[PDB]
Design a protein around this ligand. Structure first.
Ligand code: NA
Ligand code: NA
Ligand code: NA
Ligand code: NA
Ligand code: NA
Length: 166
C-alpha cells in the first residue's frame, strides 16, 4: 500500500476534432506559432498564437485554418511568452487581436460551454477565464497544434492552477 504523489486525462497528440462541451482542452505548446484554432463555420473563427519573449513589432506568417495569413505581432515582455486570441467573423475576413495571456508556464485552455468559447486572459499567475459568444458553440470544430489534456469543467480550478503555475 503506497501513497501516490490533483485528479490528468492525456497527453493527446495534435488533432482536429469536435471537442465535447463542458471540458477544458489544456494545451501545452513548446514553440512559437499557432496553438489552437476553432470555428463554427458561420460567424466565428478563433485562432490562438504564441509569441516568444522579446519580440519587437514584426509581421509573421501563420497557417490559420489552412490559409497563409500575415499578422503583425509583438511581445514587449522580456521574461514571459504571449498568447493572442485572433478572431475573424467570415471565412475570408481579417483577424483582430484579443484577450492576450502573458505566460511563464506556456499553457493555454479553451472550452466549449454554455453558448461561448472560453479562453484564459491576463498575466500568470493571475489568469482568469473569459468567453466569446459563439453561435452553435457546441458543434465547433477545433484543431490542436500541440499535445493537450482534457479536464472536466468541475475541475476548472485545477485547469486554472495549471494555466497559472505549469
Ligand atoms: Na485569451
Ligand atoms: Na500559461
Ligand atoms: Na470543450
Ligand atoms: Na452568449
Ligand atoms: Na490559479
Amino acid at each position: 500500500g503506497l501513497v501516490p504523489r490533483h485528479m490528468l486525462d492525456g497527453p493527446y497528440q495534435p488533432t482536429s476534432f469536435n471537442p465535447p462541451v463542458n471540458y477544458w482542452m489544456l494545451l501545452a505548446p513548446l514553440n512559437a506559432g499557432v496553438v489552437v484554432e476553432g470555428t463554427n463555420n458561420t460567424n466565428r473563427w478563433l485562432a490562438t498564437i504564441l509569441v516568444e519573449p522579446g519580440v519587437a513589432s514584426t509581421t509573421r506568417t501563420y497557417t490559420l485554418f489552412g490559409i497563409q495569413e500575415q499578422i503583425t505581432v509583438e511581445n514587449s515582455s522580456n521574461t514571459k511568452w504571449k498568447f493572442i486570441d485572433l478572431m475573424k467573423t467570415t471565412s475570408s475576413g481579417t483577424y483582430t487581436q484579443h484577450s492576450p495571456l502573458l505566460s511563464e508556464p506556456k499553457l493555454y485552455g479553451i472550452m466549449k460551454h454554455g453558448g461561448q468559447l472560453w479562453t484564459y486572459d491576463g498575466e500568470t499567475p493571475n489568469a482568469i477565464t473569459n468567453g466569446y459568444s459563439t453561435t452553435n458553440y457546441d458543434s465547433v470544430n477545433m484543431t490542436s497544434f500541440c499535445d493537450f489534456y482534457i479536464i472536466p469543467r468541475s475541475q476548472e480550478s485545477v485547469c486554472t492552477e495549471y494555466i497559472n503555475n505549469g
